DNA sequence: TGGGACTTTTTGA
DNA sequence: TTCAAAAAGTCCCA
């Protein structure tokens, strides 16, 4: 809740250098560089140093070209503090610290203590740098969210993040021909909520460079994945984007004195993306991956959304009140008609699900409060207060002992395919035990009209293959290190096929399932069967 | 302290 | 009425 995050000095140096590398101080000796979330001025002090070097090295040229008495080395500090540096933040103390630092670098200092999203900006800016705040839909005040929805509807909507509005504000107050460079989360590149935002960035600025750190850790002790976006508003004929994607997420960012050394090394991969060819999604991949993805998309006639019905797991609202161990003695109080098997994301393997260790009390079947009063008095009631603070319980839609978002039972108590919402690899398992789960596991079942065309065994055989792992990870949402988001908004967009290899792929999947379900489970032959199935799928897809 | 295993429920629509 | 997205994730240990 402090609101101030230290951006590493390497990133700050890289961003400032990216914005001010090729600035013609002779042509324009009055550049306006702004940081709308400056905090203690990590970016602004480096901006001051760079500007001081520029002015000191061109002071005599400026003196000849302009007022001789005005352009002096002794007057550089005052000029920079008067006409060049602009900062804004909400923290009074951080603004005071930055003001003290700028004063002690050697006068009206242009530092503002306000909300940058509400401030009426009196002029546009040549350069904009900084690190905006990241606040999700849970940790954001509701009235402020209403304000954002009312005024920033072009980029902010539904489950959008706060920094979308900061992106929009940076684009709005950027002078024509100006350059902006910021560090933000990487999720908006692939997230559904970022769609509108991406469109905005596509339709108002030219994207110069995207530095994607994927799942690395740039901020110490902070669970966020970061990217650096550099863009301009110049008159460009061809709009191409230099995309730099990290290859090894196990790095210490201080491996080099400069970020450019890391970018131009074997630790990063560079390619080019045509901005005019960008779709609703931004598919930032190299030529090989692009050809692979296009070949898979063309060769497949169906998608999972076409043939399957998907749903999210139960949302109890308070798991500690409804989930218990199968060996718990309190379960003797509850009849088996109210008990469902309960699995977690770690219980999902590639083809089969681990046997259930937990039981869920489906309290929605409790008809009368007086009946089964022992269960409410000794199990569910222990968290009654918490259960009463849920949104649907304050409004009277749910009884305090009911599940907040208990779905239809008929969807879970059937044969279906389940997969964790976050994983390092594809894990699509067939559930035979009518397992219930929380939102950490998503489920789907084949529509009855496609049962003859696609079976569960074939689907899990092709989905768990390395080919489809790579194919899904092309457009997947990279959350953290070795973690991808497996949500319906991208899982249901996977495209599938059927051809002459359907029978052998299904048979190999059945053999793998049979081996995995045996007692003396030696998974060695499973790998060989998987390799054979991968070769079959690669032959089928022409790759 | 840094790195790996694992993942709740609040929330807008 | 009731769906599904969202990591400035969360938590523990050598």
Residue numbers in the entry: 26 to 131, 141 to 577
How is this structure described in the published paper?
The newly discovered CamA enzyme (named for Clostridioides difficile adenine methyltransferase A) is another orphan MTase, is present in all C. difficile genomes sequenced to date (>300), and is active in all C. difficile genomes subjected to PacBio single-molecule real-time DNA sequencing (which can detect N6-methyladenine—N6mA), but is rarely found in other bacteria. CamA-mediated methylation at CAAAAA (underlining indicates the target A) is required for normal sporulation and biofilm production by C. difficile, a key step in the disease transmission, as well as for colonization in animal models. CamA comprises an N-terminal catalytic domain (residues 1–320) and C-terminal target recognition domain (TRD; residues 320–577). The basic surface of the cleft between the two domains forms the DNA binding site with residues from both domains approaching DNA from opposite directions.
Accordingly, we purified CamA-DNA complexes and grew co-crystals, using a 13-base pair duplex containing a centrally-located A:T and with a 5′-overhang at each end (either an A or T). The complex crystallized in space group P212121, resulting in a structure determined to a resolution of 2.68 Å. In the crystallographic asymmetric unit, there are three CamA-DNA complexes (A, B and C). The CamA-bound DNA molecule undergoes major distortions at the 6-bp recognition site (labeled as 1–6), while the unrecognized flanking sequence maintains B-form. First, the bound DNA molecule is kinked between base pairs 6 and 7 (the joint between target A6 and the 3′ G7) and bent ~30°, resulting in the largest movement of ~23 Å towards one end of the DNA molecule. Third, the π-stacking force in the non-target strand is disrupted by Tyr455, which is wedged between T5–T6. Fourth, the target A6 is flipped completely out of the helix. Intriguingly, in the CamA-DNA cocrystal structure, we did not observe a bound cofactor in the SAM binding pocket next to the active-site, even though exogenous SAH was added during initial complex formation. However, the added SAH had dissociated during subsequent complex purification, probably due to the low binding affinity.
